[PDB]
Structure 1
Amino acid sequence: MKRTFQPSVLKRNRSHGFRARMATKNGRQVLARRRAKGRARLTVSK
């Protein structure tokens, strides 16, 4: 049976990449929240 997760690197970066988050005001707030919490990985870039 086909499952929900079908990986694709190109689509992953275009949806949750670092540059995608920096292109919108709300996206930049996501980075600020994660920086405050001290996350070791901010995005899914690598």
Structure 2
Amino acid sequence: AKGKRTFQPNNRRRARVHGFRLRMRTRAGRAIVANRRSKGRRALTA
């Protein structure tokens, strides 16, 4: 009976992997942030 689902919340890992200090680190991440800012989103990054 191993009913272990796929989402195990851990906000430290959330912020560490999808965080702002990480999106602004590589070229692609800066592009993603600018793209979201252009589309108008309210949550630029996790």
Output the TM-score relative to the length of structure 1.
0.90
Structure showing greater relative contact order (alpha-carbon pairs closer than 8 Å, 6 or more residues apart): 1
Give yes or no for the alignment of 1:10 onto 2:12. Answer: yes
Structure 1's consecutive aligned runs of 4 or more residues displaced over 3 angstroms after TM superposition are none
Question: Alignment length, in residue pairs?
Answer: 44
Kindly provide the CA deviation profile for residues 7-46 of structure 1, in whole angstroms up to 9, marking residues without a partner as x: 00110011100100001110000001001100011011xx
TM-score by length of 2: 0.90
Unpaired runs of 5+ residues, structure 2, are: none
For structure 1, which runs of at least 5 residues remain unmatched after alignment?
Answer: none
CA RMSD, Structure 1 to Structure 2 (Å): 0.5
